[model samples]
Target: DDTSSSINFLTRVTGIGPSAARKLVDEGIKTLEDLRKNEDKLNHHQRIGLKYFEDFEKRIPREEMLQMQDIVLNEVKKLDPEYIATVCGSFRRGAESSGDMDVLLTHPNFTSESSKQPKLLHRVVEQLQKVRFITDTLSKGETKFMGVCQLPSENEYPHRRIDIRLIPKDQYYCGVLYFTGSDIFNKNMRAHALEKGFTINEYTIRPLGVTGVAGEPLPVDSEQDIFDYIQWRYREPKDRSE
Candidate 1:
């Protein structure tokens, strides 16, 4: 394993690049506590990243993730009986612990191009908030809700980071593949897709021509279909830890 300094580790956060990490270390902002005190130096996302740096960095136990999953699935299912969702990321990778909870939700009636806020999306969030399960919303858009959540009490649990992605029904498996990824594995999968004259993203995978214009997305009913499209044997989520 490669050993690097804590400054190098800071670079792992979303908006903190190597230069920013160096700047932080140079300014004696070496810890999350130090970062919290030095907020003026951070941009919008960086601020939130630092604000919950400890909580975000902390590993959530598998049991806790299961409880949170049940809470969300139960509530979301109430909104639409046919709604489908799953806890992804490291949890789906079968990791014993995870940095945060990522749940991708989809329903037959919800589409990204829909005229306005879909009622199910709104009601699910509203219900979570009402139950005090969701403590803070970092951001919410038509397709995603980023927030902090904690289970029904026991004060030891900190504000855990969460992402609720609202994917369309047809695109749900693609969303799952993208979100339940090891970054390197995801990059490799996309690279493989490209080499096969296809373009793959969280939304869809489409075939391209000798020139540039790509054709429509091929029908994908499962994650296995995505791998098959690129001619790679499907690896289960747990085996995708690379």
Candidate 2:
């Protein structure tokens, strides 16, 4: 079974062919370490296979995801009680599994005007790292942190991929709606908005001009409001998977 599993695993990586995967499995490349030490078994087309494992790409169960979200929220709230954080993506859509954690963060004090010059994100990241929740940072910028995190050893969880974005409070709801998406749903919503003479995006929803220009951002207090603007029947996050 390990032979079949190895071939199946290698085939999961894009550009890796079944024949090549079989060859590696037959050559005793059963583990990533074995495969790495014996790259000569793979042809040039499969050369990039190892690069995909540079980051954690395993799917995480919803239960584990909830624990991770709670841990992150608790840590962040301790730093700033008023800060808002929403875990988005497939998890938000009530998926039983997810590939990564997508957290959208905002604070009243961090407005569009103040966002340009705030260390709030850095402060939050530092706090999480201090508590040993954030294990490694792949990239961190003023507005976003892409990294790996893990639950405490007591829970015995794997290092998981996480992304946190510090966005303007005014744009928070829009960002949440955009990030909590089934790509198909997002596209359908945007198409519907355009049909209703509006433009919708991660930042804001605005009315479209006769000349097809977007007007000023509208007042969006919730994701439902975005659907209302386009007169679409509002679907809850759990129902948006379609």
Candidate 3:
């Protein structure tokens, strides 16, 4: 907002194309600094945009993502063959480019609410760091780890943004459905679930019991089960984006 036009700042972030940039600045979002301050107004994409403001502006190619996926899969599988791992977000949605990578990791032995030793999420992240895949840790907990990662090969130096979550196996498909998402479509799907007396979230989907309250989460071993429980037709990952 230094008397120079604010359009460039808004346009630089992901999800804020021309019209949104213009409208935000016209309503006085004149700088990236201003964007940082207006948290309540940002949608999911806009929030992701500003969170990794500079790095998210740089898009990762599908090839590099594929390589990273292989590296993660091989490394993670070595520890436990049954461990489930996937690169979620727009990449899982089959988008050619994505703002940042979201990788979800889960193992049958790790329960979300259990008090387990040598937390699996931490152990996996440590292994990934040993191979120099995870470049930095933004935030981490027993259930979710947010960070940046890059392929270790020469001539590839992009500091791509990444997130890793340790979902419970019982809720893994729910996690997949939540993360392999077009936020708008996910919103609509959740709304539709509610209309049919089901409540859904990143962790689980449950039917409403008497008194109109959500019951215990249903067993969802497959992504299709979420749709089945809600009485909606299933959508493949590629078809999930709104």
Candidate 4:
């Protein structure tokens, strides 16, 4: 009937905020199917509207995700030169958009250095905290950090949330796969590990008979090595979401 007014209907939804609803309309997501298929592309704010599947059926606009990525990449690069980071999660899955940006950091020598050594991740977080553009820090730890910051823009804008994590060079491969996940893909990998009688922990998978599940982490010299150990077909970042 088209009796549903855009502003009134969107604001009535529990999770759908004003700005987020407008974003959805701008993107041309006017139905449920659009929301389901494009859920992976929603950014942080946009996802609020998706808390309820009924409301989320209205897809948020695509341009927002693209804008968010550009903002994240520039902020991360400013953090360090050697700190190679990528936007993972739905964004990495190649969704036209994403909910949040999951960034992974590692150095070349991660494998050789013992876990006991000074972690490159620790240093990266310290530097990130010092950036003036970073307005606030949500959380920080050995492996992860979440915060909010704004890019250099003349116009007023909301503070963007950023998540950063550091992984040992040896764990980089698995880390990449984990961060670049669709929840469905991650669950599938976990299920496969269980079927193989191995336990897939965040760092590495250990077989049932392994004496020390905590033994020095396996050496992931390359991304392929990770796939070989897990017995999964290796997929490029672009091919993983599907």
Candidate 5:
């Protein structure tokens, strides 16, 4: 009876199977006290058990983010020479590390109408999968794909989460700015844009009509142009980290 309950504790907390729990029980970890006694020299499962309880999120180093950026860019560049891809998230904001990678992609041929075709994004993902870069997919749609990827190298790296989104070329810069954000910075920018009679968002910036309806989407050739419209001094990606 004692060992049976001990086994339940091991399996429930650390998520090991029954045989694994018994293996630990056989190794003298028969109770919570026993685990604490050996905590100083925690075995593989013991450390994982502790981590499971801690419930912390992992951050990827900026260096690894750069490697991922290069890998994705290399594969997608071959798909279309005119395609534009930017790595956003904290990496774009010059953080030392980031939680995930967000890549915004745009091509000259994909507009609001053409981007409706799923193949626009699927082709890039397929090319990445062909090269063994993207290992697993969580969700995929016409415009956005959430997936996992691992760097192909002799050195081992934990799999990382990635998001790839296809945006119309006309809205590309706005999408980049949105994805490149520190959320607070984006919030502040949007509010400031409103004060200047423009509404800014991931899709486009529009001028407020006489009665406050959003006017036509403004032409945004570059990130600078978005700033130019609201009459705000251009803040570089690094500076936008605020």
Candidate 6:
């Protein structure tokens, strides 16, 4: 049987090609552990490749993904009751299963007044790190956290990998569409945009004819608004993946 589907699925998102995926699989790099924990055993290429390996490990199973969401929502709610979250990526696509989860956070009154200025997301990640369910921290940056953990399961499912990304309210919609992506869909969307004299980027969409190259980013408050701006039908996460 061909196991390449899983490898391809993972590599496509991580921007790794077939050769890298094969190398990982050959080295028994199935779970995050085989890559992250066992790093010392890998050669130079494997180590270099593993740098981007977190992208594949980023998808968490659906149940655990929701639990993480609950953790984030509950924590942020205590701090800012108006804060809201939406799971993007494959989770939002309605995948019965996922490698990890992508979450987008925002608030009705999201401004400097509603919250402190510097690195609010980092604070949120710090609080979440204290949660009992979170097993290990994989990689953390200003905007993203990768880790492993398990949910409260009655049966015997092992720990799952979880990835959380903190996008600015301004970039929420673009981040949603970008992360909740079918690689082909996004490429085609970009091509379509360019054909119509527009440019679609991870941050914004700009009309080419306006103020020079790509122009100023267009305003988009919601994911639906992004689709409207691009003139494409709205696709839920599941549809995007399928």
Candidate that would win on TM-score:
2
Instruction: Please give the CA lDDT of all the candidate structures.
Output: 0.81, 0.82, 0.80, 0.60, 0.81, 0.64
User: What value does the lDDT take at residue 185 in candidate 4?
Assistant: 70
Per-candidate RMSD, Å: 4.7, 6.3, 7.0, 10.5, 9.1, 7.0
Q: Which should have the higher lDDT, number 2 or number 4?
A: 2
* Candidate 1 structure lDDT: 0.81
lDDT of 2 by residue, 37-57 (tens): 876766543544354465456
Q: For residues 1-242, what per-residue lDDT tens digits would candidate 1 score against the true structure?
A: 13247776777665688888888888777766777788899876677766676677678899999998889988887777888888899899988988788988887676645635556576788889998899777777876888889888854687798888778877888889998889988999888889899998888999989777767887877899998888998899989976
Candidates in order, TM-scores: namely 0.75, 0.77, 0.74, 0.57, 0.75, 0.65
Model with the higher TM-score, candidate 1 or 4: 1
User: After superposition, which runs of candidate 6 have C-alpha atoms over 4 Å from their true positions?
Assistant: 1-64, 106-118, 153-156, 210-212
Q: On residues 133-182, what C-alpha lDDT tens digit does candidate 6 reach at each position?
A: 55566666655766655565655445555566655566667777887677
Q: Per-residue CA lDDT of candidate 5, range 1-242, in tens?
A: 87688888876544356786687788878766676676655555444544433221467898889999998998888988788999988788888988778899988788876647678789999999999888777667888987777788885676677889989999999999998888999999999999999998899999996879867898889999989999889999999856
Please rank every candidate by lDDT, starting with the best. Answer: 2, 1, 5, 3, 6, 4
Error of model 5, residue 95, in angstroms: 0.8
Question: Measured by TM-score, how close is model 6 to the native structure?
Answer: 0.65
TM-score winner between 2 and 4, please give it: 2
Between candidates 4 and 6, the one scoring higher on lDDT is 6
Off by over 4 Å in 3: 1-56, 115-118
Better of 4 and 6 by TM-score: 6
Candidate 1 worst ten-residue window by lDDT: 111-120
RMSD of 2: 6.3
The residue pairs that clash in candidate 5, if any, are none
